[PDB]
Amino acid sequence: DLKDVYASKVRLNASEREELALIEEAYDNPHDTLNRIKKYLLTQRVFKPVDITMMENYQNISPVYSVDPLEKITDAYLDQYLWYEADQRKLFPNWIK
Amino acid sequence: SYNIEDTILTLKESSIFDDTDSTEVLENVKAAEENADREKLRLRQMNKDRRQKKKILNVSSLDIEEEEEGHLIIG
Amino acid sequence: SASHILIPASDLSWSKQTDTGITHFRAGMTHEDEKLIPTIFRYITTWENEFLDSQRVWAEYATKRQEAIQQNRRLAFEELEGSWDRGIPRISTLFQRDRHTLAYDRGHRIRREFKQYSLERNSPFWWTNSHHDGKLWNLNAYRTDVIQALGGIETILEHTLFKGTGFNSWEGLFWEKASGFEDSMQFKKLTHAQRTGLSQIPNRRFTLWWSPTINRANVYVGFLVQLDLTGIFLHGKIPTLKISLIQIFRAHLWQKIHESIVFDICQILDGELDVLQIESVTKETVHPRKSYKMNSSAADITMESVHEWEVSKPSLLHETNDSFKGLITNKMWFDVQLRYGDYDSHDISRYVRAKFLDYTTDNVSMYPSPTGVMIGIDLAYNMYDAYGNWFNGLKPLIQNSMRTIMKANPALYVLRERIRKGLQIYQSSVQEPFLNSSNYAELFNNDIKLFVDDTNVYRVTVHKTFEGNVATKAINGCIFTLNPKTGHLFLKIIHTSVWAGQKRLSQLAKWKTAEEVSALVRSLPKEEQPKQIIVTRKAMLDPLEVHMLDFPNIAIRPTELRLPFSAAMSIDKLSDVVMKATEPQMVLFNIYDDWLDRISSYTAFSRLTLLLRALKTNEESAKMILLSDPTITIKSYHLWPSFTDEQWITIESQMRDLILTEYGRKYNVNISALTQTEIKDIILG
Amino acid sequence: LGLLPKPEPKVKLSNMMSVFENDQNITDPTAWEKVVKDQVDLRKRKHLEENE
Amino acid sequence: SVLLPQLRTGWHVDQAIVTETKRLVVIRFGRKNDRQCMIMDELLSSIAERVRNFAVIYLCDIDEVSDFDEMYELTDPMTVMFFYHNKHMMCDFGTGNNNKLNFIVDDKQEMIDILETIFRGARKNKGLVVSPYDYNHK
Amino acid sequence: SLIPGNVDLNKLTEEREKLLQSQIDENLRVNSLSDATLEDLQKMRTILKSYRKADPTNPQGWIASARLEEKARKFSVAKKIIENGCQPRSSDIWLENIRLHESDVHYCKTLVATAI
Amino acid sequence: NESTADILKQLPHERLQAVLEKIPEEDLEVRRLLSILKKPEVVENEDVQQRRIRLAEILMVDEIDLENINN
Amino acid sequence: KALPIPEDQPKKKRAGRKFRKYKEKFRLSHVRQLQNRMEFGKQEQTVLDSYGEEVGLGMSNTSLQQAVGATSGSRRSAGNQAKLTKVMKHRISEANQQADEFLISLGHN
RNA sequence: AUCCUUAUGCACGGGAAAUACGCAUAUCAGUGAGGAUUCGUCCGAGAUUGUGUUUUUGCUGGUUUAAUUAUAA
Secondary structure (H helix, E strand, C coil): CCCCCCCCCCCCCHHHHHHHHHHHHHCCCHHHHHHHHHHHHHCCCCCCCCEEEECCCCCCCCEEEECCHHHHHHHHHHHHHHHHHHHHCCCCCCCCC | CEECCCEEEEECCCCHHHHCCCCCEEECHHHHHHHHHHHHHHHHHHHHHHHHHCCCCCCHHHHHHHHHHCCECCC | CCCCCECCHHHHCEEEECCCCEEEECCCCCCCCCCECCCHHHCCCCHHHHHHHHHHHHHHHHHHHHHHHHCCCCCCHHHHCCCCCCCCCCCCCCCCCCHHHHCCCCCHHHHHHHHHHHCCCCCCCCCCCHHHHCCCCCCHHHHHHHHHHCCHHHHHHCCCCCCCCCCCCCCCEECCCHHHHHHHHHCCCCCHHHHHHHHHHHHHHHHHHCHHHHCCHHHHCCCCCECCCCCCECCCCCHHHHHHHHHHCCCCHHHHHHHHHHHHHHHHHHHHHHHHCCCCEEECCCCCCHHHCCCCCECCEEECCCCCECCCCCEECCCCCCCCCCCCECCCEEEEEEECCCCCCCCHHHHHHHHHHHHHHCCCCECCCCCEEEEEEECCCCEEEEEECCCCCCHHHHHHHHHHHHCCCHHHHHHHHHHHHHCCCEECCCCCCCECCCHHHHHHCCCCCEEEECCCCCEEEEECCCCCCCEEEEECEEEEEECCCCCEEEEEEECHHHHCCCCCHHHHHHHHHHHHHHHHHCCCCCCCCCCCEEECCHHHHHHHHHHHCCCCCCCEECECCCCCCCHHHHCHHHHHHHHHCCCCCEECCECCCCCCCCCCHHHHHHHHHHHHHHHCCCHHHHHHHHHCCCCCCCCCCCCCCCCCHHHHHHHHHHHHHHHHHHHHHHCCCCHHHCCHHHHHHHHHC | CCCCCCCCCCCCHHHHCCCCCCCCCCCCHHHHHHHHHHHHHHHHHHHHHHHC | CCCCCECCCHHHHHHHHHHCCCCEEEEEECCCCCCHHHHHHHHHHHHHHHHCCCEEEEEECCCCCCHHHHHHCCCCCCEEEEEECCEECEEECCCCCCCCCCCCCCCHHHHHHHHHHHHHHHHHCCCEEECCCCCCCC | CCCHHHCCHHHHHHHHHHHHHHHHHHCCCCCCCCCCCHHHHHHHHHHHHHHHCCCCCCCHHHHHHHHHHHHHCCHHHHHHHHHHHCCCCCHHHHHHHHHHHCCCHHHHHHHHHCCC | CCHHHHHHHHCHHHHHHHHHHCCCCCHHHHHHHHHHHCCCCCCCCCCHHHHHHHHHHHHHHHCCCCHHHHC | CCCCCCCCCCCCCCCCCHHHHHHHCCCCCCHHHHHHCCECCCCCCEEECCCCCEEECCCCCCHHHHHCCCCCCCCCCCCCCCCCCHHHHHHHHHHHHHHHHHHHHHHHC
16 A cells, blocks of 8 residues: 555655565565564654645645655555454444544 | 378468468478578579679569569368 | 537538448438537536435345355356446445555545645645545546547547548557646756746647648638748748748748659659650749749649540549530640648648639639649648549559658658647557667666577478479477576477477467467476567567566567577587477577587677678688587587687688678678668678 | 876776777687787786886 | 947948857847846846857847847847848747747746757758747737 | 566465465465457467367367357357367367367256266 | 876876885885874774875875875 | 756766666666557456556566466566665664664563 | 784775765754653664755767969960
8 A cells, every 4th residue: 555656656756665675675585674663553652844835726735645655554554454453453433434 | 172282281370360270381391481581592602693793683672572572182 | 518519510521531422411400409519517426316225235144145155155247247437335346456544444434625735736635545436437428428429439530630640540650648748848958948848849739730721711711821931821820830830841841842753743643654645845944933822823734645635524533424526635734733622621622623623714823725724632631633634544543652752752741740739649550669779778887687589490401303393391499588698598499290280380489489478487486487488570570569468577579670680590419409309399408508508798798799690691602611620529418519719719700701701792881881870780780 | 198008998807898999899809819829928027027 | 248249330240140150049029128138137047057058149229229120020028039141040839920029938947958959950951940848829 | 676567465375474474473356457459369369269270179279269268258169169179089079179169057958978 | 299198297196106116015114104294103904005106196185296205 | 066067978978887787776667568569459467456456467477477367477677676675774783683683682581 | 923803094896875965163962862662661872954066076988282484476
């Protein structure tokens, strides 16, 4: 899910190819990257600034956030996990939808 | 079964579907490349002569068309 | 399109050219429910209809599940092939190969809505992944229904230039996406302005491709102008089409066409003086600017009578019945006039007889005799007509003339390129770049690679005798493959017995080969399976592919280099194994013997290419050059006589010398005229 | 300014196939192998030499 | 404005137009009390240094020196004209008057693509430069 | 690698889990690609036709025009085409046609029977 | 035969290269002249020759007069 | 800073071996061309983006591989495979080891 | 006399990168540049500022026929 912004793109800009690098490495040497995650969870409390630019509906301006590709990884892993467990334990009842 | 000629003969190159049902030929390997390289050579020396000596060709319809123009055995 | 807008009936008319004659088409005379661009509204299923199908479909699912279960069987793919595409989770989902890892995905739909925040691109479909749900619509059918509802392809292309490029049929061609060209120009270094300039071209190819129907009376009205030196009018500036048309006509091309044609005609009748008894024929002088001057005209080609000529009522090239008793006169002319047409008028004939009847009965048009033929041409569509006075032996000639000509003139053919650049349409051959002498050095790169030969697979060889003639036999053939690195060959010999019970051995041969390659790769562990498998004969592209399908990694090239790997069979040891073969089999060799241990694969391959390239030429007279030292041993291991390195220096000097000598003899270009390049090309091709 | 000799491509085995220096890339396969190989050992020597 | 130097004389004018060798010459003809002749003065004010390599900018009020009015046909408050080696540079804007210029360009980047594009054209000697942008509706 | 069609997940996972668990122990037809166009399908039918009319016998040829064709469509086409060329020594034609046309114990065991 | 040999000598490396030429070659004499010029007598790892060079550089950079004018 | 000068320059063409491997990055692949070629008269293959929007891959599969949906292995260039920037690289590796010693402190305890 | 080590220099072979590297009379900077955390501490050398190149440096690669002049009159 960090891959598929790109799967169209012909021309990776700079910041991209940086990401797509990471996505491939962690996608290659997982056991290491997992270890990196678990540490980040257990300790890291400081983070690199995060950058807004605003989308447009031409009606509702919405905000849009962008995070360091590293951090985005530990996130998307964690998030993936929480949803996996939370539905394994039937936290969310019916009417949340 | 159709031939073109201690000499061995091999099957000439032909496309599967373009050939389909058509008469198949037997040519000599040395003779094919022989003739082809004679013709192509004759084209090269005429290229160098034309471009070097700066002469304009007569050619046109019948000549170029004739350039487009360019024995059964039982075993 | 979602809207009601229909097809003006005038736009369904089209044309075609038969050798026999022009045939025309209009489907608009027959009035029916008139023709509407089919609009999305019909191609979508109301949500209800679906959901209902979700209930039922899922039902028959779960049931039939309990059926195969009631057999302790799992649902055969067969049943549900009854209906895939129906139901909200759909079906092909259940059959997705990866489902085991999707069950571990949960809460996608909450994400996919949130993707709004994380990043920019609008995600107009945010209510489904296609992995989970499948695919919720098919606009396939729409394509067809628009085409057909526009009257089928041809009736479209009549709206294009496409006849201009004069491919007979379109069935072999590929387009060129502009996005590719554009991007391929973006990796360079470009000013923001330079950058905008890459917006255009993907238009400019468009408005050409449509220029006939974009450019016409019914559309821009307005007042005509002409392009500078040529015969085309622009109902409006159309700033693109102007420029691109110019770049279609430069070097005053229009003229050069005209002249080229006329010139070819006099080169025809010139040969025909005899047949018709024409006392002579002259290309006239021409006001140099005539070819494109429209209002007025002059004659071109002059024609004479041994006695006289019986004219006819002026008629059309494809008409048959003639009145020669109409008149008798002497001497004739021809005009060649070009018009570059529209979809409005793409029909020349009427253009001819308009210009014939006009100029003939015109005052200012100067035709020495009021007897002579009009030959016009549509550049745009490649159409041609002549509405002339007539003799015996004209139409039967002239028709054959033009036919040959449209296939011929360098000029016309230098439209049909110079345009089909502008449009960037290409004929499809193969994209894969061949080995050339430039490409050559790459062979020695680190890809595992093979060469493959079909030449000697089927051999019926001939010799001369005392009595009947031509001793000729079917022979066990060789399928000659090698890897230039390790020099391992593979020979699949095909024994005569297999050949006997079949006919039309050409194709079947190649197929035998293609299999021998597929399986032959399958004799290799993928560690040793190769990448570029280099074909010799072009026709082996297709049959390998079909049998190499399961090996996608493996790229297949033909080359332009004629590679003398058949002359190898000249070798004793080879023809030993092959001629002695009682059954089709596989036989390994190292053609390098060991030249490796001595010297690197590169050279080892080079000198090999020498031995072979000569063994197609001096053959035995070269074999002496191999055998000129008896002192030297040829093992059962090896093939080539062993030597010192120096000895090879001497040999390869000789062998080198031959191919030159005999070459520059057969082709009678002295050896001394040849560039190092040129020599080695001769060594290669 | 011309005082010194213009350089010339060093040519290794790997590089040998590529070089379009005019000299018998194919025609003399082995005599061309020669000049290359002895080229390398020329240098390599000059190294050992200089050290000494 | 302060960046933009100005002309006080037809003499200044034709000397300038002659005396800039290697780069484009840009001149606004407009009257200080015009609206646009302020705006456009700003737009060009922001591009001065950034283009200074291949072109140069000067302001001229018709009211100062009205000489050229007759010969270059000056109507409108503000008409920019471009001269490179003394030749009148002609870049068709699709606006319908290929010579000179009239209206207001609202983008820096645009304006630069113009000054540039024309320039590059004038270095080849082509009399016609074809604008990147057809603003015709103006 | 980003040409989007080539991707399926499950192969990916098996290949990756082996890579991970192996590392640690040392430390101790996808939907995405759209369906076959008509006249291409027609083309494979044509080339397979030429390769069939290569050898009328030699069933691997017909087998190809069985399997390859059957991979895009099958339906009644494939079945009639396998029943045709079977007109029988090689148990292979029967192994394929059995697995294919059978669909019911009765006719399953008619392709069993005549085979026996 | 002028501007050539001029640039040729005017090139900094050559221009130094003559200035090397004249100076004696010993540890003792040069090293002296170093410490006289006040520079550090030895730089961490250097064989003699490099020390001589090291002078020459110091002479050029500063634009000193010659070693006799040193002394 | 002043925009330099619009004028184009005669291309320096220096293609080594080294320099080439440094090119293969920025120049379209082969495959990336076999996208672009749109087979005339016949609808593309397309796939569905992340967004389901269709990315045409036109010829990237020889028409024999469309009928079977064989996708492609063909050639995969390792030349342009994306790789980290210098800085980022050491932040990655660095953080990895650091987390690994933290771990091993959960290894022995 | 032999070896290892260390650093540096000249080299030879081989790989890697050319979003990298510079440069600067800049400015500071073990007399702390900068960072971290388990909050007890720990780590300890460049950062800033401006500036230039950066699909590149030098070189080298292939396609859009001279003059002279001779007859018996």
